[PDB]
């Protein structure tokens, strides 16, 4: 059994919806981080709000599942740095349900902390952003933008995730990248010739390549064979069934592969209310209709927004005489999707679209 299936189904549906807002530009997010945060919100939801969140998050034992998956993601390894941490910041004068606070700590280890939103909201925002910055080793410095919290803010539920790994085999830093039918942009390429898992997903007309990090985390890249990015078919037809078949432990066949991928860095910020609403999570965001009585007996809360910020920096860092070129090539000189997979849990930690150097 794939123990991360709900989260993966959500990750893919979320990507499809986000792509409606952003169909062609670079995209990057951590579906894991979002699922975790939303799970903590779900714990406080009731009535129709709850029923819709369960549908959207693909839950149709959830909390014990997150705790177990989180434990596996956080396991000490020696091979890379990988940390996922949740946090709850609550208005100091507010009275939340004792069982909500207890259960959120039990299953999410969110170390519930009081802050002063009512009178010092800007100070509270700075503190929250500083906490995330620390957790992300400086990589996500200002998660919550100006105006995101105010005197009516009652609780901010946070997840931070951080990953730093080295490739099992280092690349060599070696050029035109095809952005669309009217644009080519020079990019620094990285080259590797190594025994790697490579296949082809006919239903998506795309090559898939696995690049392992040291340890049980890998990057999978999906590269299509339109006059825009070339990703229309792949993005519209990708599903859990089609993808999981190919990311599964032993489907693919290892071969000597010559790989060229760009060296790249992405940094993207999102506000997900519109997206989550479109996916079916309406009542949570409806000031009138939301039911978060699980958080507060007074039933006086609603979800105002969900902020997400994610970054990635891909480089050559890892742990002669060959001249033939008869075998597989994977030349990522045009737009591709990629994902960073925790192999033990089968959870997607990060997912993106690289289309514009």
């Amino acid at each position: 059994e794939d123990l991360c299936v709900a989260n993966t189904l959500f990750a893919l549906n979320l990507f499809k919806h986000l792509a409606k807002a952003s169909p062609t530009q670079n995209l990057f997010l951590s579906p894991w981080s979002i699922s975790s945060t939303m799970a903590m919100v779900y714990m406080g939801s009731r009535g129709s709000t709850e029923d819709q969140m369960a549908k959207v998050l693909q839950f149709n034992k959830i909390h014990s599942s997150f705790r177990s998956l989180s434990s596996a993601i956080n396991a000490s390894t020696g091979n890379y740095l990988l940390e996922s941490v949740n946090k709850l910041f609550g208005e100091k004068s507010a009275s939340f349900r004792e069982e909500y606070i207890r259960l959120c700590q039990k299953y999410y280890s969110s170390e519930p902390q009081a802050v002063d939103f009512l009178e010092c909201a800007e100070e509270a925002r700075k503190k929250i952003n500083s906490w995330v910055k620390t957790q992300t080793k400086g990589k996500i410095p200002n998660l919550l933008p100006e105006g995101s919290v105010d005197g009516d803010t009652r609780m901010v539920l946070v997840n931070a995730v951080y990953f730093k790994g080295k490739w099992k085999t280092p690349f060599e830093k070696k050029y035109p990248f095809r952005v669309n039918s009217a644009q080519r942009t020079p990019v620094q390429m990285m080259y590797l010739r190594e025994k790697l898992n490579i296949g082809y997903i006919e239903d998506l007309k795309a090559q898939i390549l696995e690049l392992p990090y040291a340890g049980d985390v890998s990057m999978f890249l999906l590269l299509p064979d339109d006059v825009s990015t070339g990703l229309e078919l792949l993005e519209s037809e990708i599903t859990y069934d089609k993808l999981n078949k190919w990311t599964s432990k032993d489907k693919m066949a290892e071969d000597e592969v010559e790989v060229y991928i760009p060296q790249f860095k992405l940094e993207e910020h999102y506000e997900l209310r519109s997206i989550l609403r479109s996916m079916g999570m309406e009542d949570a965001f409806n000031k009138g209709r939301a039911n978060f009585s699980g958080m507060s007996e007074r039933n006086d809360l609603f979800l105002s927004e969900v902020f997400h910020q994610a970054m990635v920096d891909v480089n050559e860092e890892g742990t002669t005489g060959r001249t033939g070129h008869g075998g597989p090539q994977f030349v990522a000189d045009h737009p591709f999707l990629f994902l960073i997979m925790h192999k033990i849990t089968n959870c997607i930690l990060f997912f993106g679209r690289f289309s514009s150097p």
Binding site: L29, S30, S33, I34, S36, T37, M38, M40, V41, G44, I128, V132, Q135, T136, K137, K139, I140, L143, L144, S148, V149, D152, T153, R154, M155, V156, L157, V158, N159, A160, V161, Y162, F163, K164, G165, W167, Y213, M219, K287, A290, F292, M295, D300, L301, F302, L303, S304, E305, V306, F307, H308, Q309, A310, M311, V312, D313, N315, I340, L349, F350
Partner: peptide
């Protein structure tokens, strides 16, 4: 690869 992310869900009073 170095990768990181944050998510923040804001609950507001009404």
């Amino acid at each position: 690869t170095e990768a990181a992310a944050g998510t923040g869900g804001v609950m507001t009073g009404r």
